[PDB]
Design a protein around this ligand. Structure first.
Ligand SMILES: CC[C@H](NC(=O)[C@H]1CN(c2ccc(C(=N)N)cc2)C(=O)O1)c1cccc2ccccc12
Length: 222
């Protein structure tokens, strides 16, 4: 993510890091002791999930590593447009919850009022580097009308736009599937946006999690 800074160490207990081949692939969000949400475009074989991490270069006493034993991409995901860019990952065992490992409640209300949000991740920064320490930035949800204006004809009801007019804080490569948190609820997932990253003119685009309540429930209860 670009134009942010290191997160407070205790402020992100729901953040997951998704690895394959020993390297960071995506972010993710713990939503249940057995389940992490990420972007559909993150699907690959041999996925490992790290919970409780802050610095990727350290073996942290709070961390837990787990294999993904089932990956359930949304059946209607459209790779070209990123429509329905959501996937549920079932962990090999219930997450060992702690002060630093906690699920984040979902925003189920698609009419929810709160537009002050934040994003987090270990993706690319404004200098091009990939940080060991998780980065955070405050950004704002934009109205559906302003979102449609930024990407004419390319915004569906399954997408939200958010960004920052002052500094252009924005998510980036490596942050996919990370949470857009608004009013301390999960509102969206990092999906797509401008390259180079930066939201001063075109906002980042996020999967609208409130549209997936029923699919999430059916998947978890199957
Ligand atoms: C799963 C592969 C991974 N895909 C992505 O990160 C996606 C997400 N995204 C992207 C671009 C701009 C914004 C924005 N809000 N402005 C948000 C997301 C993008 O372009 O692709 C990836 C792509 C390229 C380099 C990487 C390096 C390390 C780890 C993952 C990398």
């Amino acid at each position: 993510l670009v134009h942010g800074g290191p997160c407070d160490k205790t402020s992100h207990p729901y953040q997951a890091a998704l690895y394959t081949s020993g390297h960071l692939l995506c972010g993710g969000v713990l939503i249940h002791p057995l389940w992490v949400l990420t972007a559909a475009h993150c699907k690959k074989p041999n996925l490992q999930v790290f919970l409780g991490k802050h610095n990727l270069g350290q073996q942290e006493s709070s961390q837990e590593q787990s294999s993904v034993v089932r990956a359930v991409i949304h059946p209607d995901y459209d790779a070209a447009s990123h429509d329905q860019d959501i996937m549920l990952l079932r962990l090999a065992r219930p997450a060992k919850l702690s002060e630093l490992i906690q699920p984040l409640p979902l925003e189920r209300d698609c009419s929810a009022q709160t537009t002050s949000c934040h994003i987090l991740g270990w993706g690319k920064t404004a200098d091009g580097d990939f940080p060991d320490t998780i980065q955070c930035a405050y950004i704002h949800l934009v109205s559906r009308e302003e979102c449609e204006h930024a990407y004419p004809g390319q915004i569906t009801q399954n997408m939200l736009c958010a960004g920052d007019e002052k500094y252009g804080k924005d998510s980036c490569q490596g942050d996919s599937g990370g949470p857009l948190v608004c009013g301390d609820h999960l509102r969206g997932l990092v999906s797509w946006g401008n390259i180079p990253c930066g939201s001063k003119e075109k906002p980042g685009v996020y999967t609208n999690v409130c549209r997936y309540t029923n699919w999430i429930q059916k998947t978890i209860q199957a």
